[PDB]
Amino acid sequence: NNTITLYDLQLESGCTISPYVWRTKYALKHKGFDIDIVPGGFTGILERTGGRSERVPVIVDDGEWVLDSWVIAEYLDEKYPDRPMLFEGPTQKNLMKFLDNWLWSTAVGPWFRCYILDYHDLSLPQDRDYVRWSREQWFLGGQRLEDVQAGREDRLPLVPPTLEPFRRILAETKWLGGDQPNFADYSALAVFLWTASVARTPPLTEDDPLRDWLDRGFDLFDGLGRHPGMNPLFGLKLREGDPEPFVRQTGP
Amino acid sequence: RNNTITLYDLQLESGCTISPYVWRTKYALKHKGFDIDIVPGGFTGILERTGGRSERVPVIVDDGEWVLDSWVIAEYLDEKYPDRPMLFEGPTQKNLMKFLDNWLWSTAVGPWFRCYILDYHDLSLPQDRDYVRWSREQWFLGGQRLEDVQAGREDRLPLVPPTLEPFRRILAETKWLGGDQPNFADYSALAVFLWTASVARTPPLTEDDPLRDWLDRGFDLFDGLGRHPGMNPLFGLKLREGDPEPFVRQ
């Protein structure tokens, strides 16, 4: 007090990679708490916690253990209604999940393959083996990470245009939460926060309209998304035959 | 004014509402507990029917207040009647339902429009038929004639159910988009399927589609608002050997 312990999932740079952990960090700072960060990575999670969890994020509030990023957010609104609210109501929760699933299929799907080797190489030394064989086999390969990531220069141009439905929303609002951000923003942002933690070449063009919301989000809470290990999201260079990355239109 | 608001409808020959914008307005009004004074009429003569006030419907008249556009009407009701059940819970709902609505219009309305545009024409009021024909055959392209656009729908309709899975995924975990009770998010989404049911002379969904629970409860709301005599069934799509599996069965 005013502190809550958080079990992180970090890269070798100390930088968070897990989007679930990312939106939980933002949710905690939204509520105005200080975070006691427990470092670590993909391996040894059960041992790092008291045996209470095989997954992160996990928080400990005084001595109350809360598992699952979604549950954590609901817990914070329930126990601390006096601090800035994360959810507007039940309708937000349902429509959030629809947006989140779409971002995951549209952005995370393709980008995961484009950065799967960077993902591995940027991980903690103890993690790299576990990440290698399991990722190139479970999620899956069926073969190896150098072969899956190869050719990303050809895939990355194809993603920006597909994000237009999301651009369409942010064109007419400052935050998903309106004039101020909430968990809808943080959950959406987590997709791009993960991407920045592993993207050793930028997935978006320098003038993508998303940049306004993205930079503001990453700057929130004293630069929560500006950890020294983070990579630029912007700088994608396109070719004559590439698709236009976004709709260029003004503006009645 | 008792408890009454006037609504300029957009009806087919059966008296059934076709416009999804009008549909979600009917639900919004009933959600607020109002009685609806319906002004009938179809696609033609809207400027005549209104005071020269609108070329489009829905329009409502609340005592002397004329209100245009279904989204604005919903906001107007929440602003003027904060004592009656809320349509929006806040700004976040508004932003995220636009995202869902946009997706539903791209995924469901677009393909089903092409599949039912001739039925749409045939079911409209007699005085609207030629206008709907000429209008649609120049604007939304399709394009050819109504007959050509709708031709081959038996091969296209089986392709739509699989693409609705992202929407199923949400409804499999909640009673309503609004939670334990419906609100404008539900009514806006339902309006897509209400429109479809008004023009679909062959069913677009299988009898066992997991969407049916929400759809039937939705259509049944407010004394069967979605059960007007003219409505066609959404269910009964007959899949053939080659067709894709319509939904995830896990």
Residue numbers in the entry:
A (entry chain B): 4 to 255
B (entry chain A): 3 to 252
Text from the published report:
Following oxidation of the α-hydroxyl group in GGE by a Cα-dehydrogenase, stereospecific glutathione (GSH)-dependent cleavage of the β-ether linkage in β-(3′-methoxyphenoxy)-γ-hydroxypropiovanillone (MPHPV) is catalyzed by the glutathione S-transferase (GST) enzymes LigE and LigF, forming β-glutathionyl-γ-hydroxypropiovanillone (GS-HPV) and guaiacol. LigE catalyzes stereospecific cleavage of (βR)-MPHPV to (βS)-GS-HPV, whereas LigF catalyzes the cleavage of (βS)-MPHPV to (βR)-GS-HPV. Consistent with their classification as GST enzymes, LigE and LigF each adopt the canonical GST domain fold with an N-terminal thioredoxin domain (residues 1–82 and 1–76, respectively) and a C-terminal α-helical domain (residues 93–255 and 93–242, respectively) connected by a short linker (residues 83–92 and 77–92, respectively). Biochemical and small angle x-ray scattering data suggest that both LigE and LigF exist as dimers in solution, and these dimers, related by 2-fold symmetry, can be seen in the respective crystal structures.
Attempts to solve the structure of full-length wild-type LigE (282 residues) and LigF (254 residues) were unsuccessful, but C-terminal truncation constructs of both proteins were generated, successfully crystallized, and used for structural analysis. LigEΔ255 and the LigEΔ255-GSH complex crystallized in the space group C2 with four molecules in the asymmetric unit with electron density for the bound GSH molecule. In the LigE dimer, helix α4 of one monomer is interdigitated between α4 and α7 of the other monomer, and the entire dimer interface is contained within the α-helical domain. The dimer is anchored by a hydrophobic lock-and-key motif in which Phe-101 of each monomer is in a hydrophobic pocket formed in the second monomer. This motif is seen in several GST classes, including Alpha, Mu, and Phi, which display the more typical four-helix bundle dimer mode rather than the elongated dimer of LigE. An extended loop between α5 and α6 in the C-terminal domain, which protrudes above the normal α3/α4 packing site, may be responsible for the alternate dimer formation in LigE. The C-terminal domains of both LigE and LigF are composed of six and eight α-helices, respectively. The loop between β1 and α1 is longer in LigE than in LigF and occupies the space between the thioredoxin domain and the α-helical domain, whereas in LigF, this loop is moved away from the domain interface toward the surface of the thioredoxin domain. Based on structural properties, LigE is most similar to the fungal GSTFuA class, suggesting that the enzymes in this class are present in both prokaryotes and fungi.
